[PDB]
Amino acid sequence: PRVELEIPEDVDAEQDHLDITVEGDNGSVTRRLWYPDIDVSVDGDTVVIESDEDNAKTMSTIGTFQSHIENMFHGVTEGWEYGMEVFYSHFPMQVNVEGDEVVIENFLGEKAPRRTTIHGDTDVEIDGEELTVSGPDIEAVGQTAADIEQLTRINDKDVRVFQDGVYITRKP
Amino acid sequence: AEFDADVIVDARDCIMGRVASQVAEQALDGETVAVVNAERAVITGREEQIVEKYEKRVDIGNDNGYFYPKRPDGIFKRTIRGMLPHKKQRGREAFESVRVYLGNPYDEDGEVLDGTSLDRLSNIKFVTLGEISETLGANKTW
Amino acid sequence: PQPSRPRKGSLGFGPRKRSTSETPRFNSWPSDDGQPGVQGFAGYKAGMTHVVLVNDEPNSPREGMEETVPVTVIETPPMRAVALRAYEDTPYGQRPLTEVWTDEFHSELDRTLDVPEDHDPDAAEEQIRDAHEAGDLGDLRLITHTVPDAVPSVPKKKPDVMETRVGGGSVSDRLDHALDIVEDGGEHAMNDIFRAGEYADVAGVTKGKGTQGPVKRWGVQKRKGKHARQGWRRRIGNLGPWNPSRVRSTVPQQGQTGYHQRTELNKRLIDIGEGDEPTVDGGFVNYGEVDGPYTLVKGSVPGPDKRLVRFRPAVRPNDQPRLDPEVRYVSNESNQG
Amino acid sequence: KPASMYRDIDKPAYTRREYITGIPGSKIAQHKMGRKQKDADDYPVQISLIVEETVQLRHGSLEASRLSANRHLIKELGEEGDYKMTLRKFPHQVLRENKDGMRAAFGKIVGTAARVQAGEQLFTAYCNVEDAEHVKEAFRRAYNKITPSCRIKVERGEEL
Amino acid sequence: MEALGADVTQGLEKGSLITCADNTGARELKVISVHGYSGTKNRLPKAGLGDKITVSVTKGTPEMRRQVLEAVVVRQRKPIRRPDGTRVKFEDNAAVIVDENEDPRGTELKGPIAREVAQRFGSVASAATMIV
RNA sequence: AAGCCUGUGUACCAGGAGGGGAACAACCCAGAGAUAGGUUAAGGUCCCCAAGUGUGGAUUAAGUGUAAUCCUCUGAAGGUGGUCUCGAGCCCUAGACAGCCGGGAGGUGAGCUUAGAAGCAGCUACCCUCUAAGAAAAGCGUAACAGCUUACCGGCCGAGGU
RNA sequence: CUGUCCCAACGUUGGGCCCGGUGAACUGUACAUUCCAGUGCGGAGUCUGGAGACACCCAGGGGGAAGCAAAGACCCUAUGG
RNA sequence: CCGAGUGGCUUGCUACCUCGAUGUCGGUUCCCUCCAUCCUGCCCGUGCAGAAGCGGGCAAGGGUGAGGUUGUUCGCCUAUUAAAGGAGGUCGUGAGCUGGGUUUAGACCGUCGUGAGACAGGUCGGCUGCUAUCUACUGGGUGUGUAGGUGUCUGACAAG
RNA sequence: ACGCCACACGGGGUAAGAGCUGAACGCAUCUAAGCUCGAAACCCACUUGGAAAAGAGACACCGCCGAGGUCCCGCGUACAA
Ligand SMILES: CC[C@H]1OC(=O)[C@H](C)[C@@H](O[C@H]2C[C@@](C)(OC)[C@@H](O)[C@H](C)O2)[C@H](C)[C@@H](O[C@@H]2O[C@H](C)C[C@H](N(C)C)[C@H]2O)[C@](C)(O)C[C@@H](C)CN(C)[C@H](C)[C@@H](O)[C@]1(C)O
Ligand SMILES: [Cl-]
Ligand SMILES: [Cl-]
Ligand SMILES: [Cl-]
Ligand SMILES: [Cl-]
Ligand SMILES: [Cl-]
Ligand SMILES: [Cl-]
Ligand SMILES: [Cl-]
Ligand SMILES: [K+]
Ligand SMILES: [Mg+2]
Ligand SMILES: [Mg+2]
Ligand SMILES: [Mg+2]
Ligand SMILES: [Mg+2]
Ligand SMILES: [Mg+2]
Ligand SMILES: [Mg+2]
Ligand SMILES: [Mg+2]
Ligand SMILES: [Mg+2]
Ligand SMILES: [Mg+2]
Ligand SMILES: [Mg+2]
Ligand SMILES: [Mg+2]
Ligand SMILES: [Mg+2]
Ligand SMILES: [Mg+2]
Ligand SMILES: [Mg+2]
Ligand SMILES: [Mg+2]
Ligand SMILES: [Mg+2]
Ligand SMILES: [Mg+2]
Ligand SMILES: [Mg+2]
Ligand code: NA
Ligand code: NA
Ligand code: NA
Ligand code: NA
Ligand code: NA
Ligand code: NA
Ligand code: NA
Ligand code: NA
Ligand code: NA
Ligand code: NA
Ligand code: NA
Ligand code: NA
Ligand code: NA
Ligand code: NA
Ligand code: NA
Ligand code: NA
Ligand code: NA
Ligand code: NA
Ligand SMILES: [Sr+2]
Ligand SMILES: [Sr+2]
Ligand SMILES: [Sr+2]
Ligand SMILES: [Sr+2]
Ligand SMILES: [Sr+2]
Ligand SMILES: [Sr+2]
Ligand SMILES: [Sr+2]
Ligand SMILES: [Sr+2]
Ligand SMILES: [Sr+2]
Ligand SMILES: [Sr+2]
Ligand SMILES: [Sr+2]
Ligand SMILES: [Sr+2]
Ligand SMILES: [Sr+2]
Ligand SMILES: [Sr+2]
Ligand SMILES: [Sr+2]
Ligand SMILES: [Sr+2]
Ligand SMILES: [Sr+2]
Ligand SMILES: [Sr+2]
Ligand SMILES: [Sr+2]
Ligand SMILES: [Sr+2]
Ligand SMILES: [Sr+2]
Ligand SMILES: [Sr+2]
Ligand SMILES: [Sr+2]
Ligand SMILES: [Sr+2]
């Protein structure tokens, strides 16, 4: 099979070997698209994903590569953003960005600061009880958002009563 | 330290077992063989089960001993030994006229033996000898 | 149902054989951080005493109070880095590339080595720098030796030679740092490397006890009660089960005990001085009188009096350093009595 | 006692009651279920449970499977739902157990079983197109209580 | 437990008979167990100055005899080492009966107590006539 | 149940070599004077190891498997949108399947029961208007309302879907 | 009451170890540097597959040689005592 | 309930191996192992507020102890404990120990027998050989190989 | 020894598990390719042995008519020979 993705005018995509790079006004993203017998190439104004095989496993990856590339198109132009709300009940939670990692202090009254490093060129902006994670690589951004929510995970006690933590409010 | 090899084989991206099989045959026919870029030789399959097999070989042993190599260096050398009657005169002579190297210490580039090369564009389930050695705990000296 | 019980002795210090070199050989070095510097030193064990110290630990309820502490006195005269050996990184690990020697040699270094009469320091140095350009230079170390002659209590004059790694800033800088030391005469002291209050790892060849049985050597029980009168007193029950039909090397058996190399971790240096402040009245038993450069190590040190011991900056410290501890008293009371 | 002991047909047929005494009663409560006053022809759908391997099924298993199947039909169609089910096999084969070692080993009588050849109908139910999926569910529960793997086959019925 | 501020060589074992240094009515106490202790094969469980032990009353008033109670070791003959190096030893082995909250069951303590025990059990110490 | 016990017919071991089966009384080839050349049998042809890294085609991703027979080689009932292949029925460019947007309206909060019950406690009935649709309501939700959606209709999309 | 034990230590005498002299016995189908598995009359240093293995010598405690020692004293059998 | 299995710890069955002998039970001492996990680590569910639990998953690194009766294994009981898990190694281990039980020769009691005497009943007493040839391992030497010496190292592997 | 001293942290990769991106199947989906995490367990770290590693190693200096070694002698930080 073969699928043709016309690259946006705002964007220009180059590719060597199994690596594809996508650059736009919002940045650039490089990925590796390696799977048996699937050739990904840049044919002038379009990206081509093709293979001589058409079995379920091959069709699966082809459809997967497409979305990965379309997501890259969207990332280098409009960008990707996740919104988060920091909710707490008894202990005022302090969420700050320090260096290349977001730190959370006084979670549930804990003396030790919980933290996590930010993935890639992802940007985390905090304004009160609202957080916004954004960047060109949906992979990196999506993880950073998730990691922040995971950062306040609690297994010891009943989550229904202890609901403190930062949650994903808006998904792109 | 210098090895007058009548043949220099490049294992890069080549199926270890298939190369070994041919290198054994040649050493038994009087050829002095040198396998190069061992760290880049490859073996097909699911990495997790492959590693389990080689890890088991490391754990096995006792006082008598079962010394199994961890470096891609010896893994390949041992693979070859298993295809030679190394305890017989003729067999030990052949095995001893075969050496494996990390990278290529020669000026010539090795040759690729027919039917031993693997196509990375058609295969995703395979592993590198070097990757196995790192997993085994070897000190990446290559 | 036969209660559980840990085995007798550790399986990590074997085989329990006589050591090859009476001079200890570190098998690991500190990490490269601060400025370049020799990562070790050596001295000769003299004996023990105790010192009264002011509790240093900031987390101790006794902080600031008098505290008695055991101390092993080690004579640490100046040593001499006589050469700079360079290692190159190869597919088979590290290998010595070349060495840069000097001209100034101790009058009796020829009791152990065939001292150099003709050498080319720059030729060697050049080969090293070319290697560094190529990016094949492995760590850098100094050939070092002691001056037993400076220690009256030790009968030997024949110097003990060991190699000590040099760690530091950039390789270029520590390389230069090394060459400087050597060129001079190599003469350096405990001061140059250690400061009282830091933690050092001490290595040494333990006291020898010749052949000893399983009880003493491995810590197995003696026969008990009625069993102790039947003809067996200090022999283990059996050498193993019916199967496997062989004796495993893990069963505690007789053999050489002592005179093994040991590396004791995190030994606190209580004080580095010089003179005779630590000497005991009557003299250290089986040793003599201390009156020169010395070091006070907290606690015990492997080896008998007179043996060579090696110091190294702790490679795995647990506590932060509390420099120059206040020593309010050093006992000089006779050790005979 | 495990069925492994009696599931195979590795012994002569042993059914002659004129030469066998003290045979335990059957645990099978009924062979005709549902509305036994009605005919099988009065139904559009007819589904049978077919045994895929030749075997012996102890009366204890027949009852357990017959039970778990009809018990489901009751729960889903009511104690009088419009359906009828039949267990067509009867446990004729008498079973022994040797419970002195191998001396005079001929076993004492301990039970009865039915011999079923592969491809035979053990159970056959008749229902309306609506209750077709309910009878299929009763059989699924039934074949989980007899030794062999089975096929739930729809004989009279094509509303698919 | 809270550090003692002194090194101890346990001088007692399971089964040892010791003095009950109080006015509870129990004169002799038999050591049965050591709170928080876990030994090793063949090792007779040991207790020393400062430990909380379970005990049975061997000698004393009828009401007290045969009772299984908790207690605190206050004195022992085997030496203990203090921070300044000096060793400290007593004339006998003694313990004081205690309740769930570690308060002495009796009203008065007989004989001297070790200062180290005071650190651990304050209410016990604040009943001591002498503290050495 | 047994490498169990006890029959029966037969071939074999015993008393049967040699070839094969890793080894191995009775499994396969094979019944054998000596010596010599040749061709096969069982079995095998990537190396160890004589002969193929043989050809056309397909499947498998688990190292499944590379294990005729067997005390010896396990693998079961039950389950599987892992994947490949074949058949039947129905829907679909008069636009299907799914997703997204929009609409989801009135008589009337049906009657009854009830202080109240207004799709949704229970009982009965389950009717007709506007219209391109829209139940006397399929599932949550409320003290009861509210609220959120399923059915149902319209658009966007565009090719197979079930 | 105590080293029976916790829990072992040091010491004493005679051996043990090295040297001169004296100088046996048990045991021996052969071969034999083995180890892990397998196989086999079902409990192999010797068969099969691998692994390991440079030779000789000293001291040791006894895991294996289904170790050495005695034609099983249990059990059954004998037209035995 | 019924149905399907895995293990080879119990018991039973069989009679293949040894009757010109493969030393018993229990205990002890010393070594290795298995996981069907008692504790410890990391997790999932809860009839999960918390605390304390109950159930389940990965997981064998380490730990799993001291005592009273009994020859006991097993088991009962006590106080401690994070917990005081189970099993294999000729039911590991007598050319290592012990010798309390079973099971010689002495004796008593009960039951049986005309009796000698018997008991899958109880009870008191009642023996533990050998100088290691080979192999195995723990430690110590002498030689040869690598191919003049001194000193310093490297690290394939190996152990925890 | 009954006395005294010392015996990590941290990295890397995983299991169960928590997730991200994501298709087969326009949706959904932690999984099919890819990825972020995550056990006292695995690897590294750390300690001990280790030129007989038969690819039997490296470096520096001394020496081949003399470097060095053995015997001898006085002794032990060593030791049954
Ligand atoms: C103290 C010295 C004596 O030594 C003994 O008494 C031993 C402890 C004795 O042992 C004693 C003591 C004891 C407890 O066994 C250790 C007992 O069961 C036997 C019967 O007698 C041995 C082990 C017996 O040999 C054993 O004979 C058993 C019947 C079978 C067993 N093996 C094969 C299972 C076997 O080793 C044996 C039958 O005596 C061996 C026979 C070859 C030679 N004897 C006759 C000699 C002359 C001995 O008398 C002796 C050397 O003078
Ligand atoms: Cl090994
Ligand atoms: Cl061979
Ligand atoms: Cl692949
Ligand atoms: Cl003992
Ligand atoms: Cl206790
Ligand atoms: Cl014939
Ligand atoms: Cl494999
Ligand atoms: K016998
Ligand atoms: Mg809780
Ligand atoms: Mg003294
Ligand atoms: Mg004094
Ligand atoms: Mg005990
Ligand atoms: Mg015959
Ligand atoms: Mg060939
Ligand atoms: Mg397989
Ligand atoms: Mg006989
Ligand atoms: Mg008899
Ligand atoms: Mg024997
Ligand atoms: Mg498990
Ligand atoms: Mg273990
Ligand atoms: Mg046994
Ligand atoms: Mg034995
Ligand atoms: Mg014996
Ligand atoms: Mg003996
Ligand atoms: Mg008795
Ligand atoms: Mg008796
Ligand atoms: Na492979
Ligand atoms: Na190994
Ligand atoms: Na004796
Ligand atoms: Na034995
Ligand atoms: Na009978
Ligand atoms: Na014949
Ligand atoms: Na054969
Ligand atoms: Na396989
Ligand atoms: Na004594
Ligand atoms: Na032996
Ligand atoms: Na079974
Ligand atoms: Na025993
Ligand atoms: Na464990
Ligand atoms: Na008991
Ligand atoms: Na045995
Ligand atoms: Na015994
Ligand atoms: Na004995
Ligand atoms: Na980790
Ligand atoms: Sr070939
Ligand atoms: Sr050294
Ligand atoms: Sr080392
Ligand atoms: Sr004895
Ligand atoms: Sr054996
Ligand atoms: Sr039969
Ligand atoms: Sr079934
Ligand atoms: Sr081929
Ligand atoms: Sr083909
Ligand atoms: Sr068998
Ligand atoms: Sr089979
Ligand atoms: Sr199945
Ligand atoms: Sr001996
Ligand atoms: Sr497991
Ligand atoms: Sr747990
Ligand atoms: Sr038993
Ligand atoms: Sr009992
Ligand atoms: Sr045991
Ligand atoms: Sr006895
Ligand atoms: Sr009895
Ligand atoms: Sr009796
Ligand atoms: Sr030779
Ligand atoms: Sr996962
Ligand atoms: Sr060498």
Side-chain angles (χ1 to χ4, degrees), chain B residues 112-141:
Chain B
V112 172
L113 303 165
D114 294 306
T116 77
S117 200
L118 180 68
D119 195 319
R120 278 169 173 283
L121 304 188
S122 297
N123 288 291
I124 241 177
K125 293 188 78 165
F126 68 82
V127 192
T128 280
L129 259 190
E131 293 174 296
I132 292 174
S133 299
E134 294 187 66
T135 294
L136 292 182
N139 189 304
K140 183 169 180 176
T141 174

Coordinates of all heavy atoms in Angstrom, one line a residue, chain B residues 112-141:
Chain B
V112 N 32.2 -9.6 2.8 CA 30.9 -10.1 3.3 C 30.7 -11.4 2.7 O 30.7 -11.5 1.4 CB 29.8 -9.1 3.0 CG1 28.5 -9.7 3.3 CG2 30.0 -7.8 3.7
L113 N 30.5 -12.4 3.5 CA 30.2 -13.8 3.0 C 28.8 -13.9 2.5 O 27.9 -13.3 3.1 CB 30.5 -14.8 4.1 CG 31.9 -14.7 4.7 CD1 31.9 -15.5 6.1 CD2 32.9 -15.3 3.8
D114 N 28.6 -14.6 1.4 CA 27.3 -14.8 0.9 C 26.3 -15.5 1.8 O 26.6 -16.5 2.4 CB 27.3 -15.6 -0.5 CG 28.0 -14.8 -1.5 OD1 27.7 -13.7 -1.8 OD2 29.0 -15.4 -2.1
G115 N 25.0 -14.9 1.8 CA 24.0 -15.5 2.6 C 24.1 -15.2 4.1 O 23.3 -15.8 4.9
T116 N 25.0 -14.4 4.5 CA 25.2 -14.1 5.9 C 24.7 -12.7 6.3 O 24.6 -12.4 7.5 CB 26.7 -14.2 6.4 OG1 27.4 -13.0 5.9 CG2 27.3 -15.4 5.7
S117 N 24.5 -11.8 5.3 CA 24.1 -10.5 5.6 C 22.6 -10.3 6.0 O 21.8 -11.1 5.5 CB 24.4 -9.6 4.4 OG 24.4 -8.2 4.7
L118 N 22.3 -9.4 6.8 CA 20.9 -9.1 7.3 C 20.4 -7.8 6.8 O 21.2 -6.8 6.9 CB 20.8 -9.2 8.8 CG 19.4 -9.0 9.4 CD1 18.5 -10.1 9.1 CD2 19.5 -8.8 10.9
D119 N 19.2 -7.7 6.4 CA 18.7 -6.4 5.9 C 17.9 -5.6 7.0 O 16.8 -6.0 7.3 CB 17.7 -6.6 4.7 CG 17.5 -5.3 3.9 OD1 17.3 -4.3 4.6 OD2 17.4 -5.3 2.7
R120 N 18.5 -4.6 7.5 CA 17.9 -3.8 8.6 C 16.5 -3.3 8.2 O 15.6 -3.1 9.0 CB 18.8 -2.7 9.1 CG 19.8 -3.1 10.1 CD 20.9 -2.0 10.3 NE 21.8 -2.4 11.4 CZ 21.5 -2.3 12.6 NH1 20.3 -1.8 13.0 NH2 22.4 -2.6 13.6
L121 N 16.4 -3.0 6.9 CA 15.1 -2.5 6.4 C 14.0 -3.5 6.4 O 12.8 -3.2 6.2 CB 15.3 -1.9 5.0 CG 16.3 -0.8 4.8 CD1 16.2 -0.2 3.4 CD2 16.2 0.3 5.9
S122 N 14.3 -4.8 6.5 CA 13.3 -5.8 6.5 C 13.2 -6.6 7.8 O 12.4 -7.4 8.0 CB 13.7 -6.9 5.4 OG 13.6 -6.3 4.1
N123 N 14.1 -6.2 8.8 CA 14.1 -6.9 10.1 C 14.2 -6.0 11.3 O 15.0 -5.0 11.3 CB 15.2 -7.9 10.1 CG 14.9 -9.1 9.2 OD1 14.1 -9.9 9.5 ND2 15.7 -9.2 8.1
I124 N 13.3 -6.2 12.3 CA 13.3 -5.4 13.5 C 13.6 -6.3 14.7 O 14.0 -5.8 15.8 CB 12.0 -4.6 13.6 CG1 12.3 -3.1 13.6 CG2 11.2 -5.0 14.8 CD1 11.1 -2.2 13.6
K125 N 13.4 -7.6 14.6 CA 13.6 -8.5 15.7 C 15.0 -9.2 15.5 O 15.1 -10.2 14.9 CB 12.5 -9.6 15.7 CG 11.1 -9.0 16.1 CD 10.0 -10.1 16.3 CE 10.1 -10.8 17.7 NZ 8.9 -11.6 18.1
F126 N 16.0 -8.5 16.1 CA 17.3 -9.0 16.1 C 18.1 -8.2 17.1 O 17.6 -7.2 17.6 CB 18.0 -8.9 14.7 CG 18.2 -7.4 14.3 CD1 19.4 -6.8 14.7 CD2 17.3 -6.8 13.5 CE1 19.6 -5.4 14.3 CE2 17.5 -5.4 13.1 CZ 18.7 -4.8 13.5
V127 N 19.3 -8.7 17.4 CA 20.1 -8.0 18.4 C 21.6 -8.0 18.0 O 22.0 -8.8 17.2 CB 20.0 -8.6 19.8 CG1 20.6 -7.7 20.9 CG2 18.6 -9.0 20.1
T128 N 22.3 -7.0 18.6 CA 23.7 -6.9 18.3 C 24.6 -7.6 19.4 O 24.2 -7.5 20.6 CB 24.1 -5.4 18.3 OG1 23.7 -4.8 17.0 CG2 25.6 -5.1 18.6
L129 N 25.7 -8.2 19.0 CA 26.5 -8.9 19.9 C 26.9 -7.9 21.0 O 26.9 -8.2 22.2 CB 27.8 -9.4 19.3 CG 27.8 -10.9 18.9 CD1 29.3 -11.3 18.5 CD2 27.4 -11.8 20.1
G130 N 27.2 -6.7 20.6 CA 27.6 -5.6 21.5 C 26.5 -5.4 22.5 O 26.8 -5.2 23.7
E131 N 25.3 -5.3 22.1 CA 24.2 -5.1 23.0 C 24.0 -6.2 24.0 O 23.7 -5.9 25.2 CB 22.9 -5.0 22.2 CG 22.8 -3.7 21.3 CD 21.6 -3.7 20.4 OE1 21.4 -4.6 19.5 OE2 20.8 -2.8 20.5
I132 N 24.3 -7.4 23.6 CA 24.2 -8.5 24.5 C 25.3 -8.4 25.6 O 25.1 -8.6 26.8 CB 24.4 -9.8 23.7 CG1 23.1 -10.0 22.8 CG2 24.5 -11.0 24.7 CD1 23.2 -11.2 21.9
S133 N 26.5 -8.1 25.1 CA 27.7 -8.0 26.0 C 27.4 -6.9 27.1 O 27.8 -7.0 28.3 CB 28.9 -7.7 25.3 OG 29.2 -8.7 24.4
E134 N 26.8 -5.8 26.7 CA 26.5 -4.7 27.6 C 25.5 -5.2 28.6 O 25.7 -5.0 29.8 CB 26.0 -3.5 26.9 CG 26.9 -2.8 25.9 CD 26.3 -1.5 25.3 OE1 26.1 -0.5 26.1 OE2 26.0 -1.5 24.1
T135 N 24.5 -5.9 28.1 CA 23.5 -6.5 29.0 C 24.1 -7.5 30.0 O 23.8 -7.5 31.1 CB 22.4 -7.1 28.2 OG1 21.7 -6.1 27.4 CG2 21.4 -7.8 29.1
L136 N 25.1 -8.3 29.5 CA 25.7 -9.3 30.3 C 26.6 -8.7 31.3 O 27.1 -9.4 32.2 CB 26.6 -10.2 29.4 CG 25.8 -11.2 28.5 CD1 26.7 -12.0 27.7 CD2 24.8 -12.0 29.3
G137 N 26.9 -7.4 31.2 CA 27.8 -6.7 32.2 C 29.2 -6.4 31.7 O 30.0 -5.8 32.4
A138 N 29.5 -6.7 30.4 CA 30.8 -6.5 29.9 C 31.1 -5.0 29.9 O 30.2 -4.1 30.0 CB 30.8 -6.9 28.4
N139 N 32.4 -4.6 29.8 CA 32.8 -3.3 29.9 C 33.0 -2.8 28.4 O 33.9 -3.2 27.8 CB 34.1 -3.1 30.6 CG 34.5 -1.7 30.9 OD1 34.6 -0.9 29.9 ND2 34.8 -1.4 32.1
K140 N 32.0 -2.0 27.9 CA 32.1 -1.5 26.5 C 33.4 -0.9 26.2 O 33.6 0.3 26.4 CB 30.9 -0.6 26.2 CG 30.9 -0.2 24.8 CD 29.7 0.6 24.4 CE 29.7 1.0 22.9 NZ 28.5 1.6 22.4
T141 N 34.3 -1.7 25.7 CA 35.7 -1.2 25.4 C 35.7 -0.9 23.9 O 36.7 -0.4 23.4 CB 36.7 -2.3 25.7 OG1 38.0 -1.9 25.2 CG2 36.3 -3.6 25.1

